[model samples]
Target chain A: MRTRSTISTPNGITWYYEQEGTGPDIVLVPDGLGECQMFDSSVSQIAAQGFRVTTFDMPGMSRSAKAPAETYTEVTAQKLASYVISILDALDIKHATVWGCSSGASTVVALLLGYPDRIRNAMCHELPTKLLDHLSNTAVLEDEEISNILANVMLNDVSGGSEAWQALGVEVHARLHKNYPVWARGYPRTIPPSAPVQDVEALRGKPLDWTVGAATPTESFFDNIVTATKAGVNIGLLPGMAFPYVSHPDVFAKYVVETTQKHLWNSS
Target chain B: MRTRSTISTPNGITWYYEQEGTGPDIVLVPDGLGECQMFDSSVSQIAAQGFRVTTFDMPGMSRSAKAPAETYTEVTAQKLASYVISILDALDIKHATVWGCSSGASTVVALLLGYPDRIRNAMCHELPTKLLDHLSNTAVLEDEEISNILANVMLNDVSGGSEAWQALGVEVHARLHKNYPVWARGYPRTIPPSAPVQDVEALRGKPLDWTVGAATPTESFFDNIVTATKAGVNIGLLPGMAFPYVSHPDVFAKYVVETTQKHLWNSS
Candidate 1:
């Protein structure tokens, strides 16, 4: 089954999501890194392996409607995770193996931590617990700074800058929030560098497949590595430092399938 | 100045608050306890001290309109605190001395930690970090579970039952959400017994007044006391716990004034 739909979440967010293939469910939440398009190649590659893949643009991103920006503050990841659950409740999907690339990985952590019953297994290319350390020299960018950068820098057409801007999902944020001035004021501070792991159970016996870049392992990477090791989690390191899933979609998909089979899939 | 005003918050919550007296701004966030009524006696006592004491009903409570039930989950305190900020912005108060009693105390912590600049000084009777231990049994009761309890027990009249139900704000919740079935199903699951201390700064160098009942301290109470002691937070072990402020309104308000004077009030 291959289809695209816009489902209104219970909290008044019209989510524009796409679904393909059929078997075990996989929901891709896009928040930190970019929109659903970021997972385009991986969606097909993963779907080919007998998994129904779902990708959705977060509210105020691409085709989805904007939520009141005030709702997303320091608790952006938790709120986004709640929206994911709300979408699942909307789609009538009881449980699914959830995964996301880059910043979406943090969203995945929020989901797995907050509502474990709703997720079968989880995958994260980036860990939420190590978020503040991962980012360089800052927690939240000021609303004025973000707006100025979006207006003066992003919209000014600087080639590689555009690539990072669009790839980071700030391009759409810049454009969309510009139209909604109230949203623009509150939007920049909405997404924090990291989120707290509220549910301790999420750290114990969960299948959290960590497939991230090993090329330039930073302090945050090592911090999460220790966390993953304690939890007996599977760690798959790919060479691509920038976007591992985009560079090696086949390998990322392979890792996801292998981890799922090792943990949730019963071959008995 | 004595005024009762209704201001529409940025995210669509219409706050019903009563402001009395004229001096330094003091916004009281009502959540954990019941409603603004819970702080009725304390309001007058504090307001008489030349402070503009404002008390507002939380959204989905008394006079305030219902927010999407999906919006509140594990992050109830965070959302509630955000609404408090929205109301502050709506009321055109840039910064104010914020305080809350009982469960509202947890809400106070969220505001202080997340938006430090928005508040002059923060006062929390109950610390958020110690919530789970303080409660008797569970984290989040199921939507069905809460509904059943609310209907079967709360709605059913028993001696002191109505007092607890009404005082706990579940009576209004039962009446309001019953009319809105969609809300009722989600409302019960909305208010988790505890919330995470998302903003770490909330723990360090913040004036979190832990004026809880020393008569019967629980594991959660002690846990928070230890935390507060290390943080150099003032611990006022009171006689009452079931509802400290309600039992001794005069003392509670006195403590508030003394603390404010010591920390913020420039009494040179």
Candidate 2:
């Protein structure tokens, strides 16, 4: 059974969350769009596999409370890790299987590095570091490219631009000029900075799980999995795009269940 | 040809606007959903009728600027009148045909009353006063009704709820109870004090035009027109709803041209 609820954050935002099924706990943190609505199919499938699924909209996205302009898009991975812990504490879950996709995967990695004790196992699908770098390097100057990425790749509209303009204003351009060193830098960062590469080593002995979709252009997830696997983490591949879990829900659920049984339920 | 630009407001916010075609100038001030995109077809039709058309996203709305929480939705008609003048100054146009719809119509009335010299003519469609009174009378039950208005009528999900919660934090309930006088009162004040009933007398000799769609349920427009006509202002009817200009663009464009030529160009 699926149930929806609100958790009041310390910062006065009412975070909307959904919980479903029953068994071991699994927390799903969404990507930049943040709302858990996109993961409805995956949530259903995963929940059916004997795991209590939990998901929410991140602060300032969708139904979550609006974030301050200063810290809206400026949220760091460490801060996200703290939020994950807060959510876990709010639900009274001591340790749970954690999973994330795309930009969300960065948060999962951050949790693995910063608060490994709170997460029993971690799964990340289609990490986008290389894909982002390619986009920023090649198509950053094209208006059509910017529009296409926002509309197609992001599956969102111009409303996101308003939020960005409101949050940072001209300061956004200043940061892009300073960071990307280019005038072609758009309102939405092409290659948003992520958790540092050095931090991945912290997942050394943890049940660090990773997967990449074959349809995605870059092999960044595949490349990163090498370092993670060398450090004794589990890794796999899927047959779809950045959001394969959305399309291949059954396949995605099977991997999640197998990983949970191997690294969490069986271990416990 | 169409050109998009940004102007900096005196209060340190960047305002996005669009300009097109050439001839007599027409400034379109949109209703609460503020973005010019909503009026794209109307703009094209108006501009094609040989008027230089301009429209913008109002402050605290999409693609404009993030207004400070204190001033977010507290916009009075008088303030909007000043903003229209500022936009005119920014574009270096002295006198223009000013048009507004729904809540924006209040600004048109404000302009006619307070800044008559700046406008060549004024067009207001579907002006809501008593309609708001009906809403507040029927549904104003604190936050619940406020949420319903935004979700159902405005077709927007966020109720400036984040700003409310963030600005007051935990003390929002206290402020609501203190300001509203009762739990039945909603956030958006029904029958918000606008340019007074007495102020309608100011447009006696001005080329003031008023319109209401036939499909609109309340005859508030008709009722107001009866009073305004007694005060010697021009009034008419259209064949559609609240936003007839959007649904019946050709008829709206024809009416716009006829009004411009009759009241503005003929007088000039």
Candidate 3:
């Protein structure tokens, strides 16, 4: 069974949340601008494996209200941890496993780094660690690059037909077709990843800086593509949500999953 | 529009045929053991772009009868061209184009080389022209290494699914992603193709065994990959289909079409 609820934050933004399953609490922070609906199948697959699950929209995303002006350099990670803690406080989930994807995966990293004692286990895939530097180089939000990607997203909506959207889908399919072998070549890093946003790399060391590149400057794609490559981080790298686009078992056998198996103190 | 017809060859196998479109008739062939339907969308796309297209199930392929005995080596290329020419003659087409893809691309080269006068032109794409030498040296069709792929096509009715079948897709993707960049770095090979397939060391030739060497061999991928490097193929490289896979547009801007056009001559 599943139910929806809203949590009004101090900023007056009411984040939308969904809860399901009944094992240990599993609070899920969905992909940024991506929601629970996208993960419905994976969520159900995992939940059926005997774990309770909870998912919520990011601020200013889906059912959530817009963020307040003070929300700078504040990604869903910190807010999600706080939100989980608050729900725990209200209904008594003393410990929980955190499962996140893409930006949510980065949030899982941020969560593990910040509140180790609260998370029981964590699963984060495709987190973007490389952009932390890029994001810091520019202002946290309203950077020119982010403005461009938002513009692209709006264009996708305005394009009116599935052609542009299908083009995007085919673009990913074509890339996955193009990159999966490089992923098997023992350097997933070389899988034709798009260059890291220059902004995240530029502001690496500036005095009086509010960020050290822990945010994304332009598009969330860099973050999405780098989820499995975060080194020394406290989470294990599973394949991406859509890892095997071509589904060739022989190539799949060539993939190396062992080297990336690192779990943080609170991860499963 | 697409329609199907069948005819019995002297070899006691029934070949299924699909022919459509109008200009100079062209018989479009697929990769090794590829089904007619799977190539359906692509053939129509090309045909709609204006050329009469003819596609068919080779004996031992879907909806077509099996060969009386296994055939490989030069005989394989011989049979294909004969069958293709037969189709053209039966259709009352005086001349036609033979466009082959992957291994089929090599087949086109074979037909053009074997019966240059019977062909108007050849359009070959990503033909494993570098890999054939290694394949020729090893046991083929009957080789233990290719059994799984062959079995899938023969027993499972899996004309579309198999190991080699799947690897072929990703391999093409990876090749395009990685090789196109190097090709961009060099001057593309302009056609009337000054270098014969055998004499061309620029793309990995063993020097002067044009028949088998003219075909692609994956083991020689590094060498042929460079062919595209120092001067990409100028003659018959089609746009629209290639590029965009690397997510880079600058690399594609170099090719000036009017400069590199295939000028096939039909002596017959």
Candidate 4:
């Protein structure tokens, strides 16, 4: 709940931050759309279990002390790393655990690659790892597809951020249903049928592309995580975190704790 | 998880049904818009707890049934109650408990009134009570105001159903931050923030009127609950079962239990 004043980067961009809890510091970088708030629930759970959790408004996120002109991609790895460094400096921590989810994961990896010595350990969940491996992964052949997808996600976010996330959950559930209907039901408590994750395609049938618009802000970093990690930084993949999850406390705190502990301990 | 074969009513409406678990029955009638299959989660839960849960697709929902044109309003209530009776007749049970959520609540009240001798008890959650009482409350003006509100609610459901619900959780948390932000920093399982029973204007500032909607199938039934009770039928509302709710399963189940004990103790 603590927010830091905006700090200007050498590149003439500003970033905002908030830090909480105590233990090995774990800085949270938000998704590409600058939605650090999504981490509110997960962050508290992690913080409660003895971790200093820090989060920041991504470059153009609310109160980020930055403007929209700086395309999310332009904020670059070095800039993100510098932001992390600034937070560390402000908190007086030499090095700390840096675990990011989604776009935050991308930012954390960027920071680690840019300033390896500054990170103690890190974990990322539900990231677009396949796309991160190569730009072609996000490559779309049709302009209509791109237009439809972006319209569904980004514009949806502008009007209703939370609902867009839920629709994302439903869309995910639906695709899972179409692909693996039976297996999808097997994970009951984890995946509720009410989550229209299965029916999100219905929106595609409509002319408005709300889902795409909602997702665009976080799309780039997630799509490029693998390219950043190919640098050979040993970022361990955490188990039990599902993508497009339409459930509560996404990635459930227990799985996060166990994975973080196992990875950091094994790495050390 | 067991759906009976589609049964054709005398008027040429075909509908499928599902029955689960055992003991006294809980007839579940869904609201107008959605298909009954979506209630799989709630039905399964009730069944799991040893209740025979009955659910079916209404006319105009899914592959099961189609409505007769002039039969809209009257059939809205009658069909709902008849569906329950048919299920009971099919199962050979003379009486049972009735439970409904949202618009489903109205059907429960209607059934309780239509056949006071049949429905043993009832439980309703967020029963679209506002739609029934909006005009009298002074919170919304009659014509344009109500239409506006209806449009907004529908838009939220259609467009931001998922995202808006998630954002609701966040909004609740943010408002409760001052008192129980981090659950006193320590103690037991994380205690989520608990706020007042109702926020005066949770949906305030939105474009929609708090009270109107497109010609709903059950608008008249919503307005005439008094006539229902005057006809020797009794239905009690569950306290704290309103919208913008915090999880209070016990509060809901208590009424179900009380109703069952009074009218169908053997079922309980």
| DockQ comparisons of all candidates to the true complex | 0.01, 0.01, 0.02, 0.01
Where is the poorest 10-residue window by lDDT in model 3 chain B? B206-215
Q: What lDDT tens digits, residue by residue, belong to model 4 across residues A203-243?
A: 22211100011122222222222222222222222221222
Better model by TM-score: candidate 2 vs candidate 3: 2
Candidate 3 positional error at B123, Å: 1.8
Fraction of the native A-B contacts that model 3 recovers: 0.00
For A40-109, candidate 2 gives per-residue lDDT tens digits of: 7778888888889999877665566454433244455566667777777888888788888765777787
Q: Candidate 2, after superposition: displacement of residue B41 in Å? A: 0.9
Comparing 1 with 3 on lDDT, the higher-scoring candidate is 1
Please give the lDDT score for candidate 4. 0.44
Ranking by lDDT: 2, 1, 4, 3
Which residue window of length 10 is worst by lDDT in model 3 chain A? A206-215
Candidate that beats the other on TM-score, 3 or 4, i.e. the better one = 3
What would the per-residue lDDT of candidate 1 be over residues A142-170, giving only the tens digit for each residue? 65654454444323321113343345465
**lDDT for each residue of candidate 3 in B123-181, tens digit (9 for 90 to 100):** 55454533233233323233343443334332233222233234345534332233222
Candidate 3 CAPRI assessment class: incorrect
Q: Give the per-residue Cα lDDT of candidate 4 at B72.
A: 31
Question: Which candidate has the highest DockQ of all?
Answer: 3
lDDT of 1 by residue, B150-251 (tens): 345323521113344455465655544432333343232433444545434457776566654543223224334445544556655654443455556677
